[PDB]
């Protein structure tokens, strides 16, 4: 493997960006009827979990390439969402307990609409039923780091999503 | 100009990244005597101002390429840790002065600052960042995380905003 701390590389930065451009085209199509505009009517991006800064930085730039103007809020997102379209971003979706709570909280402010976009979905991890509208990639029952995802606050800066070696968290634990 | 809301492009994404690679080499050299390591001894990145998520996401990935492992904290467990405060824009220096002086109370091993856009003609107190990606004159810019009323952060380049944008939007408000 390319990294001494990883068993294998699951998604390279380039693979993640190819997938994100595919998702951005779908988002551009799906919101084309909304007359989004900078200042007057941006898509409100609500980024959830500290590590999602990486995904959110890349995704809002790709969305801008596809003609979807945004404004960003971080929950790690309350003022001025009534009547606005909201897209909630999260780097990983596993049990879905966080995103369920966030979406329900935001619904109380009566946005025009709310959808979710996740970089890594672990659908085997659910503790409640939950389907994200947009998913960049799926991961099975494996522990990954990279692309914002940490192990004890390290490895968020790895450009790829990789499986962390057991010998790393075993020694550190 | 490729942007109808801008009168000039000052720094492209590519130019910013070239300059960030130059800075990351200097950081790798300057911190070589700190034996930075993931988990045991990461460089602590303290990202200040909401819009700095873009710079921070790119910069921690570039630092990783140069052998400088990080952990990230956001403002808008550090005693004996090296702290590098990141901010997308340095202007009056009032924010960074306050943040640096606050962090010093927690007895970090060292503290330095790294800014993406320095506007040296904006100072209201004396302040020199240790690392600067690019200097901008006294003009109002957006892009690369920098906003006008929460819009245009997703523009990939740092551009001078067209006066008609804020003259007109100013009258909407
Ligand atoms: N970095 C990392 N974290 C993981 C992994 N599997 C589970 N986690 C905790 C996720 C914490 C955030 C909560 C997300 P929800 O509420 O469970 O959907 C994984 O593979 N990698
Ligand atoms: N978007 C944008 N905002 C600007 C610009 N110049 C000043 N600002 C306010 C700065 C906000 C953060 C505070 C930085 P400090 O405390 O003055 O050093 C500029 O050129 N563009
Ligand atoms: Mg955390
Ligand atoms: Mg703000």
Author numbering:
A (entry chain B): 5 to 80, 100 to 196
B (entry chain A): 5 to 80, 103 to 199
What does the paper say about this structure?
Trypanosoma brucei is the protozoan parasite that is the causative agent of Human African Trypanosomiasis (HAT), also known as African sleeping sickness. However, in T. brucei there are no enzymes for de novo synthesis and this parasite relies solely on its salvage pathways to make its purine nucleoside monophosphates. HGPRT is central to this salvage pathway, as it is responsible for the synthesis of IMP and GMP from hypoxanthine and guanine, respectively. Thus, the crystallographic and SEC-MALLS data agree in demonstrating that TbrHGPRT is dimeric.
In the crystal structures with GMP and 3 a dimer is observed in the asymmetric unit. In the TbrHGPRT.3 complex, 3 adopts two conformations resulting in the phosphonate group occupying alternative positions in the 5′-phosphate binding site. In one of these, the oxygen atoms of the phosphonate moiety form hydrogen bonds with the amide nitrogen atoms of D117 and L120, the amide nitrogen and side chain hydroxyl of T118 and the side chain hydroxyl of T121. In the second conformation, the phosphonate moiety is translated by ~1.8 Å, resulting in the formation of additional hydrogen bonds to the side-chain of E113 and the amide nitrogen of T121, and the removal of hydrogen bonds to the side chain hydroxyl and the amide nitrogen of T118. Three ordered water molecules are also found in or near this pocket. One forms a hydrogen bond with the amide nitrogen of T121 and a second forms a hydrogen bond with the side-chain of D117, thus making indirect links between the enzyme and the inhibitor, while the third water molecule makes networks with the surrounding ordered water molecules. As with GMP, the guanine base of 3 makes a π-π stacking interaction with the aromatic ring of F166, and forms hydrogen bonds to K145, the carbonyl oxygen of V167 and to the backbone carbonyl of D173. A sulphate ion is also present in this structure where the oxygen atoms form interactions with K54 and G55. In this structure, the bond between L53 and K54 is in the trans conformation and the side-chain of L53 is in hydrophobic contact with the carbon atoms of the linker in this ANP. The starting models for the complexes with GMP, IMP, 5 and 6 were based upon the refined model of the complex with 3.
